[PDB]
Every structure is written in structure tokens, then in C-alpha cells.
Design a protein around this ligand. Structure first.
Ligand SMILES: N[C@@H](CCSC(F)(F)F)C(=O)O
Ligand SMILES: [Co+2]
Ligand SMILES: [Co+2]
Ligand code: NA
Length: 262
């Protein structure tokens, strides 16, 4: 049951996508050594609710307790904001935001480097964003999703890193996680042909070390098994007649919002 968005639907996604992107743009100046993730979460929440007049899709979802997910270093995803977790020089941190506006969702994330970067950290973040961009450039009607997953994997592994298998991109719209599942690796199981009007996310999680992950006892936090650094970037897109449009593009993205093939 893959939903195809109408033009009106697409209009609302553009708004939701822009709101989400804006939370990430807004938070940047607050990301510095000595700030806690709990504080970042509060600032985000206040902005979403009080300024944007929107709502966080994460709060209460399956019982999730906070408004955004903040994942530091070896935390792969779903890191839970906490007043006790302070950022230090060299940390790499993912902030994943999902906002709801007029019933439509906007889902996006980026990595931030705290204070003075480490060589590994900078490199990992770069490669991960590039793997996302590569995928975006391939999106167009008629192509099989499998090709995209395969390309990401090949790229990442060629750079000496690994791709997380367990978590993947997903359709999105009135629902947070809709069909289809967007795998970030090559799999004979994948068989989905793209068509215009489809909206989904691409959000590869890449590990500096081995691919294996582990879910923590808190039941949310996921970390790499070998404790290596992990990075992720995410954008929400719409498949167009000749390519794609990135709904959550920010001022710092270096890819064009509309990608055209011909
Ligand atoms: N924004 C995340 C999901 C966060 S829901 C939570 F339960 F894990 F917070 C995504 O891209 O799927
Ligand atoms: Co997300
Ligand atoms: Co997502
Ligand atoms: Na991380």
C-alpha cells in the first residue's frame, strides 16, 4: 500500500519539510561544548510548538519520551535527550527531527561537529552526507529502489566504512512510517519501481567500524557493537516527473533542491 500524493498533498509536505529543516538551521548556534542534549531537546520543542505552531511527531510515538532524537558518537540512532549528557570537544552528534503540520510529516537529520573536530569524525560525517547525495542524484521515475541501496553500499564500503542494515528509510506523508522500506544496501529482496508522487526518506547510517549494532536496555538507544563512531543524514523527498525534489533542504546543503534528468 504505497500512497501516491496529490498535488495538494505535496504542497503540505513542502511546508512540513521546510519547518523540519528550519529546526536544524535554528539549533546550530546552540551546539557547543558543555551544552546538554536535554537542553537541545527543550529548545527544539519550544520552537516547534511556540513559534512554528507545529507538533513533534516523536513525542509519545510508541511511547518515545522526548521531542527529537539526539545521537552522540557511537550511538547509532534514537538517542534520548538527557539533562545529564553534556557535549565535549570532538563529539559528532546527529539531531533527527520530525514535525507534523496540517497533518503531514517532515523528517530530516544532520550531523553537527562539536568544538574542534577529530579527523575520523569529520571524515565519517562527510562520507555519510556524500552517500546521501549520491542516492538523491539517482532518484527518478522507473528506477528500482534496489539500485539506490546498492549504490550507497558500494560507495560507503569503498571508503572503508560499513552500512547499518537494520534501519532504513521509509515512505512518509499523513503517516510517519509508510511503505516502502528504503534499504541502504544491496538486497535481492528489494523490488520497487519508483513513480512520481511517491514521497519517502533516504537516511543512511554509517559506521566507522563494523556494521553490527546493539539495542540498549533503555529500549531505545542503539549503539555500534564495536563502539566505533556512527553517522547519519536524512532528507524527505518527492519523486517528480523527471527526478526528485528535496523537501527538507537547508541553507547548508550543497545539492540543488530540484534534481532534473534529461
Ligand atoms: N525521525 C526518525 C524516527 C524517530 S521515532 C523515535 F521513536 F525513534 F523517536 C526516523 O527518521 O524514522
Ligand atoms: Co528522522
Ligand atoms: Co526517517
Ligand atoms: Na552518532
Amino acid at each position: 500500500a504505497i500512497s501516491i500524493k496529490t498535488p495538494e498533498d505535496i504542497e503540505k509536505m513542502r511546508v512540513a519539510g521546510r519547518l523540519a529543516a528550519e529546526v536544524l538551521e535554528m539549533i546550530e548556534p546552540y551546539v557547543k561544548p558543555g551544552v546538554s542534549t536535554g537542553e537541545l531537546d527543550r529548545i527544539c520543542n519550544d520552537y516547534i510548538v511556540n513559534e512554528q505552531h507545529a507538533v513533534s511527531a516523536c513525542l509519545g510515538y510508541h511511547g518515545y519520551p522526548k521531542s527529537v532524537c539526539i545521537s552522540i558518537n557511537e550511538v547509532v540512532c534514537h538517542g534520548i535527550p538527557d539533562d545529564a549528557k553534556l557535549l565535549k570537544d570532538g563529539d559528532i552528534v546527529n539531531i533527527d527531527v520530525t514535525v507534523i503540520k496540517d497533518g503531514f510529516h517532515g523528517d530530516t537529520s544532520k550531523m553537527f561537529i562539536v568544538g574542534k573536530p577529530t579527523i575520523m569524525g569529520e571524515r565519517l560525517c562527510r562520507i555519510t552526507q556524500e552517500s546521501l547525495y549520491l542516492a538523491l542524484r539517482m532518484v527518478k521515475p522507473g528506477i528500482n529502489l534496489r539500485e539506490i541501496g546498492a549504490a550507497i553500499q558500494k560507495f560507503v564500503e569503498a571508503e572503508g566504512f560499513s552500512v547499518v542494515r537494520e534501519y532504513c528509510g521509509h515512505g512518509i506523508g499523513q503517516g510517519f512510517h509508510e511503505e516502502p522500506q528504503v534499504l541502504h544496501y544491496d538486497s535481492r529482496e528489494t523490488n520497487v519501481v519508483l513513480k512520481p508522487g511517491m514521497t519517502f526518506t533516504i537516511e543512511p547510517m554509517v559506521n566507522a567500524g563494523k556494521k553490527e549494532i546493539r539495542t540498549m536496555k533503555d529500549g531505545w538507544t542503539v549503539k555500534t557493537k564495536d563502539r566505533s563512531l556512527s553517522a547519519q543524514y536524512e532528507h524527505t523527498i518527492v519523486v517528480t516527473d523527471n527526478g526528485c525534489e528535496i523537501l527538507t533542504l537547508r541553507k547548508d546543503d550543497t545539492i540543488p533542491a530540484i534534481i532534473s534528468h534529461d
